[PDB]
Amino acid sequence: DRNSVDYAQIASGIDTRTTVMIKNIPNKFTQQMLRDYIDVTNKGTYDFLYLRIDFVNKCNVGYAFINFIEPQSIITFGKARVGTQWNVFHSEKICDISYANIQGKDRLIEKFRNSCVMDENPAYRPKIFVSHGPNRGMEEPFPAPN
Numbered sequence: 001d002r003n004s005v006d007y008a009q010i011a012s013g014i015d016t017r018t019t020v021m022i023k024n025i026p027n028k029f030t031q032q033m034l035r036d037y038i039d040v041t042n043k044g045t046y047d048f049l050y051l052r053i054d055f056v057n058k059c060n061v062g063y064a065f066i067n068f069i070e071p072q073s074i075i076t077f078g079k080a081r082v083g084t085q086w087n088v089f090h091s092e093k094i095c096d097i098s099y100a101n102i103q104g105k106d107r108l109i110e111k112f113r114n115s116c117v118m119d120e121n122p123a124y125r126p127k128i129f130v131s132h133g134p135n136r137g138m139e140e141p142f143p144a145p146n
Contacts, residue, residue, distance in 0.1 A: 003099040007075045019067045019100040026091035027059040041080040044137030045073035048108045050126035067105050114145045
């Protein structure tokens with residue numbers, strides 16, 4: 001449907017959405033593990049990342065928000081990973097993606113900057129990264145509440 005990812009439509013320039021949900025994430029995956037996993041194929045290509053952690057059992061919610069700087073980077077990630085197993089914790093789960101209903105680094109910042117997660121352990125908060133220029137991909141401090 002509307003949120004299904006179609007690499008052919010990205011390549012031809014008729015869908016320029018950039019924000020994607022990474023799905024079927026094994027329970028015990030950490031945000032650090034996900035950052036490293038994405039960076040195997042997609043280092044420097046994204047500027048927002050958030051894998052929500054349930055603090056009461058250190059299990060994640062099973063899906064992550066990622067905003068790619070250029071939509072074509074969705075093809076890089078999806079052609080490498082979608083349909084393959086996470087191969088951790090003896091999980092049977094398989095990586096998959098769909099488009100998010102919220103789109104864009106700016107919207108994602110506004111969505112989380114005033115939210116409760118910014119007041120819990122700063123290690124597991126949403127992250128943003130420099131979108132352009134020589135330092136593209138470097139983590140940026142998350143904007144303060146407004």
